[PDB]
# Entry
Amino acid sequence: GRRMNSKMQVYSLPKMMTLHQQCIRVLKNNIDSIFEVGGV
Amino acid sequence: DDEEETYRLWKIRKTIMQLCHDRGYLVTQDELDQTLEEFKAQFGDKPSEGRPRRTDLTVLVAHNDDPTDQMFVFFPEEPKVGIKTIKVYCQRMQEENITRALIVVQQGMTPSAKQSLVDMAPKYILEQFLQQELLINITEHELVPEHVVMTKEEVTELLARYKLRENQLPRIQAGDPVARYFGIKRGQVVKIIRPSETAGRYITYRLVQ
Amino acid sequence: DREVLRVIFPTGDSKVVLPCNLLRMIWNAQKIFHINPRLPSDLHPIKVVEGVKELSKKLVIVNGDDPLSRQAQENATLLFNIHLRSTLCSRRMAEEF
Amino acid sequence: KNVTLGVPRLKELINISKKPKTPSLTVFLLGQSARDAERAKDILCRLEHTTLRKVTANTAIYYDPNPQSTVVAEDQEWVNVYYISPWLLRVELDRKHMTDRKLTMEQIAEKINAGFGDDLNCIFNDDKLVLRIRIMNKMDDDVFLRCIESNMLTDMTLQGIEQISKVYMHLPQTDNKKKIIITEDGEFKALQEWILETDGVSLMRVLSEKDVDPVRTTSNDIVEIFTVLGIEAVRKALERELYHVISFDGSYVNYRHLALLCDTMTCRGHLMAITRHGVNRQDTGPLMKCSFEETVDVLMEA
Amino acid sequence: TVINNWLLIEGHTIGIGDSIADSKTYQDIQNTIKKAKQDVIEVIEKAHNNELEPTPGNTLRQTFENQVNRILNDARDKTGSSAQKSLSEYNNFKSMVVSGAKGSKINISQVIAVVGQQNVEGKRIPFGFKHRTLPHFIKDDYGPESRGFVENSYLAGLTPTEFFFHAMGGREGLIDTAVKTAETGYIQRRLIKSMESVMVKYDATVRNSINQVVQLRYGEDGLAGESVEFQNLATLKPSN
Amino acid sequence: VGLVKNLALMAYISVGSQPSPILEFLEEWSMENLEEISPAAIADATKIFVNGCWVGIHKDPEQLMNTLRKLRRQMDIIVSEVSMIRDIREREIRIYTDAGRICRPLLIVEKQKLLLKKRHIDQLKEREYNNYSWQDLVASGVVEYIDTLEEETVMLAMTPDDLQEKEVAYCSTYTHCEI
Amino acid sequence: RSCLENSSRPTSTIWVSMLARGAIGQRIVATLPYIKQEVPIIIVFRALGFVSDRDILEHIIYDFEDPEMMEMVKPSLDEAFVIQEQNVALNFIGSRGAKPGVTKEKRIKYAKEVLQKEMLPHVGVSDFCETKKAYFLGYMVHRLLLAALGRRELDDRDHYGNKRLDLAGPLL
Amino acid sequence: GDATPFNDAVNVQKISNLLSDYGYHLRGNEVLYNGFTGRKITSQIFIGPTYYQRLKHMV
Amino acid sequence: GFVGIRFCQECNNMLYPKEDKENRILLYACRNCDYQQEADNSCIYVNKITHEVDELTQIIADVSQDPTLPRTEDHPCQKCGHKEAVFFQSHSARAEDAMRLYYVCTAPHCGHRWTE
DNA sequence: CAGCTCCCTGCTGGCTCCGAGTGGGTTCTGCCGCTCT
RNA sequence: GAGGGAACCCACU
DNA sequence: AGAGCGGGGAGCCAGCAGGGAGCTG
Ligand SMILES: [Zn+2]
Ligand SMILES: [Zn+2]
# Structure
């Protein structure tokens, strides 16, 4: 008796993300989780 | 365009000749299946110049059962038709002692013209017909069944058989398109033959009111 | 009759609504009289023809002998007489029924 | 198609309505235009009404005191090829609307000239359309030119019939609107032919056109059929429409009940609606009419 | 009487085991629904890239809605058909449907597989809010669940948005009944009063109260409607 | 049918409030009155309506709406039944304090997390012996009364399971959640 | 449906309507309470104490780079051009009230009290409130223009944001 | 039993397994006997406690 | 395109077009007072029929903050290159013919709006 | 030939209809003050 | 062995 | 002197005001 239930925002990450781009975009999705960057 | 009005005039003529053949007037088979190229041969092609002239398109037919009884079919050249031109046609009716006539207007007539046709209808029978109404034969439509104008003897034996008065029949208006097509007045009875899905055939009788 | 039918029904719909169910009546006659369908029958085709003619005279809707009455009676039972002739054929009553 | 059906169409049928909710035509095509899609489209664009608004992209009032020296100068060349009022209608059209209607530019010019008597003047060329209208030969000319601009936009017929708003071409996959013919073998064979279903009715004008079947072309408008084809034709049409309404569900009502209703509705030569305005105008007794409706008015008129 | 006493022997029931389908059927129905929702998203992204073709006679939103509704109705019919073919011969829903006693096949579809699309005035669930059907949705959401497609059966139970859209769908039917009774009654009354005195007379003609001829024979054949039957003309269809 | 209706269980109809303290707060929170502005400033400023009365314009509607919601969520100047709608597309802020508005309490979701946490449930578990009640939840900024016009500008989560990140993320900006 | 808050008095409804096409263009008129004919809206703005046209159109059209709003207020301006003074506008309104006046002074008093206490009571029922009432009337005309241009969408009658519930309190 | 409308913790399969844990058929059916003859009814009858209410509309 | 209104400077009112045949030019002549003004543009009345291709001036950038508007990451901004955007449709009656997405950059102070 | 007459059309106002059949209930008539002793 | 009307509301099929 | 009398929708039809034609002095 399981109920099927899901939604989808229709449309129309296909992007060559290198090391610095991946690092900055991971930080751009988890900004608030930084305690102390060290010496950056 | 000259070609559009040439096609119009040919179709109007063909419908008029079908109408006259249906009313019982003597119409030869050559004129009944007369085609557009035969209209371009018999008449002109450029009505703006006037090679087919509407006055040249006037039809004279005679009744099958009485060759001294004839019908005119006039085609006025003006869009709106008043007293002057129908009095010209009435003088023509008098001077060639014709009884019935059809006037095929192309836009209409004045109200006083319609009143005047009703006025001399006891003496001379004139019938208004628009060009747009005559651009097809309505009796060939699939909805329109077979209309047959009954002779007064047939009406007499009809009301004798069914023991009916005239007012106990179904009615049809005098301004009905098929009643106008067959040119029938009050007191005439139309036999209407139509196919039936339960009986096969059914004959209704309709008095012209 | 077939030309009349094709005039009446230009769409080719053979379904009509008619009083007597002739096919079921024929099946009733087969079951009542124990008709063996694999034997020769003692029914002369002229009996079929004349019986259908007399029956069609006997099914009167419009009464009288006036030609107006005759035409109305012919029109009132046109489909049923067509269907009765198409069903009680001498051919169909011999090889089919 | 938004064809009215069910109870509202039944009410539209038995109350003879001068304006049905969705009046429609079923145009059948006579000849190879029934088979070819492209001359079927030619008949479609010959039937559907096309105002000048249906093709215009923009219109503008300009000031050109000298037409030799055009202000706009995007159209200077052919205007000076041509060589009045200093006021100007410059109308630019949408080319897709200009092309799918198969209109040509001189047709628009001659329709302007015929509609307004050619007292004004229209000059055109393009190869980004331009049509330039000036008025030839007490009050400012702006209000007159704006009024004739509004008349050309919302009152003008380029092609088609005015009461018909739009036309639905389709090919029937069902025999209910097909062309059932009898072949040389005596078989019944369906012919899949292009049919048109308009959103307005002008039955006389449509029936009169070329390559339109003047036999099977019909309407769902009962008053239009009565005015065009007669009383027995509208009896047959009323029977067909009532049968459609009843048998859309697959439900069956015997033919004699529909036949009795239509024979009652068309017995007296005209369309007698199933209302007080049809039944209480009959030749029946005053007590029956006062039983139905408008009791006191019927009794006073008696 | 005979069948009621044999049913005393045999017995007939309906249970919660009749709403149950096989697990393979549930996987097939969920696969059909997932495929249909993927097709709906494909149509939405085609219309959003201006790749959808506007059919003649319809505006672009009308043909978009028609394509979506055709996909969802095909989904409901296919899921229902799989569910009602998976039924065993011992099923009670199947017994009462194929006996014709009670229940459509759509009832089996809605009980077992998919309740289906909910409609208000024939269209899908309107944007009652500012371009949303409910405040649980993003704006401009034209998908199945946003505009009233219920992907659950009555056995699975509806989600709250599906429950509210189904309440809108049923309220539409209750309204349609309670406002069509008066119009139908007025139509019936006017039909009666226009022909209450029309009758077959003793000369077999059909006349009204004032003896005008309506039909010369009743139904043009003079026959009563009770004793006529559906028959076939054997000489119309065949070739020469 | 469809004319006589019933309230839902947690639906509460607003009883009415004085527009005044909202009006002094708006006066001392950078709203420029209509009687002291040129019309040329209207074209890019957000109009402010209080009980349908256009009272002024404001040029920072983020901070004004956030300040007003913060005041309502802590039972300050804005009482709990005051409805505060922001129509972003048409640059309007409508404040309704009149009676007859029907509203319901919804949980507040901020940054995809409920503001209702386990300490509230623990305190409500002993309602008889903490004197903790529903009104303290209203005072804690946890639940919020949302009416019909304000429900056009909120993004509801049906369950807190909607707030969880999905493989096909439908929305990540839920504003409230259903109880 | 205007009604001044925290005061039980019956609601006074003002309509601001825009005529159908089938003159030059689209005319905005105002069905005021207790004025039994359709006053043009520019005449109402004149009667509120606004002789000019940047005054009226700044009250109505808030952005002057927008041309379509101007092209739709143009017929309403040009139909009400012959009235240019405040008291002339007051006479033009009061001549078609429920109680006409043989004296011009009585008609001026009638139109003043109608536009003072009956036309939009919620924004102001007191003197010197012509600017707030005129901004709200301009907002009504602005919303009419936005909906007629299609830029804004028509309101829904069944939306309970548009509906209040008279309970035992307001009814009693 | 809890029958709050939207509750994932309660579904037909869970209730069926719970009913099978008490020596009943999982889908609620039982082997009923005819009261008049004593013979087993061939179908198995869905029987269980259901909340009925008596309405004011007495004959 | 569209040409704006012209306003009188003396009596603060509307101007009206008129054609002076003395210079055979176009002047904006007020008819409450005697103020006249020559016209920079000859266009007096102008209408748009199928020229509704620009829905972007009706869009204000503020709609980037709407929590109910859908956000996407697959359509980056051209001006500032932000990943987040909000997408919606044009909701006018004159945009029932189209379901074109209009996008607004979610990031503050950018405000760039585009289509496709 | 200008002004008058005389019938088609467009408009607004008026008018009349709105399913069948059942239970049960409350609340109202009637609304109060007088002129005579 | 038979002494109120009307208005309204709710409900039933 | 208290007792009693008085005082909403939908759709069709009909009349009147506008045309456009014809008519006469
Ligand atoms: Zn000036
Ligand atoms: Zn950006």
